Design a protein around this ligand. Structure first.
Ligand code: CA0
Ligand code: FE2
Length: 566
């Protein structure tokens, strides 16, 4: 079957994306933000991403067996907004506007329960037969947590937790409270490493062997003037934090900056001042989730754990789940957040139609790619001089080994918030100055934010304490003693790291580069950070890459077979 999965809607939505499954294989998958260049894909149908998906696979909407949306939108409208006003045809016109998606007739339209979509994005793509399912996000239509059993190609829900008790919303609110912003929870995770925890309950949570209770909020609380509990939980958490924490909310400041010639947004206080709150929030999240995970594993009799929902992006937490006595194996897809419910919805429907879903297979490279002619057009367009090295991978390795920072835009764009060797900025893993250089000089981002490494899978048994694939940088682990001091820009003082392991099959070019690098500096390991300007999405097109390259003080750009230098 050919099934197009979608997320994103014009009204109060984020993380628009589209994924196309053909006979159980991912033909194409991308996030709207990569095309619009507007981060988070807010308040939009995934128009560009779905257009890309069909173009990639050489299909039109008339070739689809089904279209799937990763929320029960009709139920949300009916229960929260006073009615669902759209026929399937009218809904399709919104999701897939006819001016971009000409169609003779309407494909079958399927709405999939949000947490089922999240669950399908983990289970069906994991390459594992069965396991316990833990979904933790902000909120679906109603619930913020789902515990389920994945087995026999089926997903059976065991229990849920109502939205008012959301761990996702909690974490967003803390992030907003600290001035990092609710839209940047990844930053809160990074800040947390710098703080100390005193009381992980925050005088709000109570923990037990199956999870948590939130005494702060009535679990059945429901906003009568909305379709999720975000505002209600925001009001509760902000009042509580101000009452118990020594610092009041950080505030955003909008002022005209003469040097930039525009009004810029800043924070009133340095968010670093809130590092203890960050640490404490991370600790509460971890403890809550440890209990939920232990509980679903025990109830299902499984030792393989699937995690999805946006809280599953918390690599620090994931690392600590992996080492628990109750967990033998773990799979978290790169698209654990809402961006993955397009894929998840497509999978649930495809499975229902009798297809067998193939494993993701250690790669997230499903977005657009560009031929040498296409890259050349973007280059020629700008009039910059460039080279076509006989051995580009060897040359890039040499640049990295010397301490230079290299833009790397190769093959199909990776999907999800982390660069994985398709759209990356690369630097030395071995350099004790590279971290400060990239934060302060290249990206001009917070000094306290860490970096993480890519390495050959073929060496990771020697480098990391665990011999397993870590394809997505979604899970922390620790290095072995021989590597405790060798890799200062990407390994913390406590030996922890957030790796990508790279197989030759997953990414021949990046694998070959890392191999060359290893010949130069002993270890086929590099620093791998997102290729973007601050606050902007990862670059997608050759023109995107050249633009950001032009803006940042980096040494070179390897784009397709071409090398541009500053
Ligand atoms: N349905 C719905 O609400 O969106 P979704 O499934 O994409 O999950 C979003 C949630 O992920 C949380 N989140 C994102 N990254 C996170 C991180 N690194 N650590 C903790 N929570 C995180 C964040 O706090 C937010 O509440
Ligand atoms: Fe979600």
């Amino acid at each position: 079957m050919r099934v197009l999965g979608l997320n994103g809607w014009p009204r109060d939505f984020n993380d628009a994306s589209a994924a196309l499954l053909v006979d159980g294989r991912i033909a194409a998958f991308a996030e709207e933000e990569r095309f619009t260049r507007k981060k988070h894909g807010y308040n939009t149908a995934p128009v560009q991403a779905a257009a890309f998906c069909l173009a990639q696979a050489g299909l039109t909407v008339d070739d689809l067996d089904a279209v799937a949306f990763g929320w029960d939108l009709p139920a949300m409208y009916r229960e929260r907004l006073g009615g669902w006003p759209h026929s399937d045809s009218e809904a399709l016109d919104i999701l897939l506007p006819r001016d971009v998606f000409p169609r003779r007739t309407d494909p079958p339209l399927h709405f999939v329960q949000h947490h089922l979509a999240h669950a399908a994005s983990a289970y069906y793509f994991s390459g594992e037969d069965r396991g316990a399912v833990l979904i933790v996000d902000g909120q679906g239509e109603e619930e913020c947590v789902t515990l389920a059993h994945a087995e026999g190609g089926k997903i059976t829900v065991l229990d849920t937790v109502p939205g008012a008790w959301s761990l996702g919303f909690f974490y967003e609110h803390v992030s907003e409270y600290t001035g990092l912003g609710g839209d940047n929870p990844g930053k809160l995770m990074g800040l947390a490493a710098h703080g100390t925890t005193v009381d992980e309950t925050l005088s709000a949570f109570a923990f037990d062997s199956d999870g948590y209770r939130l005494n702060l909020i009535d679990p059945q609380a429901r906003d009568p003037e909305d379709w999720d509990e975000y505002s209600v939980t925001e009001r509760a958490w902000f009042a509580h934090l101000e009452r118990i924490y020594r610092l009041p909310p950080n505030e955003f400041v909008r002022r005209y900056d003469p040097a930039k010639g525009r009004v810029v947004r800043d924070t009133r206080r340095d968010p670093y001042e809130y590092r203890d709150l960050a640490a404490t929030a991370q600790a509460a999240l971890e403890r809550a989730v440890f209990g939920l995970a232990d509980s679903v594993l025990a109830r299902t009799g499984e030792r393989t754990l699937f995690v999805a929902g946006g809280v599953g992006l918390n690599a620090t937490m994931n690392g600590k789940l992996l080492t628990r006595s109750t967990v033998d194996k773990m799979f978290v897809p790169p698209v654990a957040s809402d961006i993955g419910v397009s894929l998840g919805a497509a999978a649930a429907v495809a499975v229902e139609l009798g297809d067998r879903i193939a494993p993701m297979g250690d790669t997230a490279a499903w977005g657009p790619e560009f031929s040498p002619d296409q890259v050349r057009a973007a280059l020629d367009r700008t009039g910059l001089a460039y080279r076509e090295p006989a051995n580009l991978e060897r040359e890039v390795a040499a640049l990295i080994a010397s301490g230079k920072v290299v833009g790397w835009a190769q093959g199909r764009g990776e999907v999800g918030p982390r660069a994985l060797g398709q759209r990356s900025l690369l630097g030395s893993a071995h350099s004790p100055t590279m971290r400060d250089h990239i934060n302060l000089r290249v990206k001009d981002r917070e000094w306290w934010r860490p970096f993480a490494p890519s390495m050959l899978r073929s060496v990771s048994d020697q480098v990391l304490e665990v011999d397993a694939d870590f394809p997505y940088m979604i899970m922390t682990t620790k290095v072995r003693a021989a590597y405790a001091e060798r890799l200062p820009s990407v390994v913390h003082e406590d030996w922890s790291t957030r790796p990508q392991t790279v197989t030759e099959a997953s990414n021949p070019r990046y694998h070959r580069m890392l191999t060359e690098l290893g010949d130069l500096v002993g270890d086929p390991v590099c620093l791998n950070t997102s290729f973007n300007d601050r606050g902007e999405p990862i670059v997608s097109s050759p023109a995107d890459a050249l633009l950001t390259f032009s803006r940042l003080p980096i040494d070179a750009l390897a784009v397709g077979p071409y090398l541009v230098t500053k």
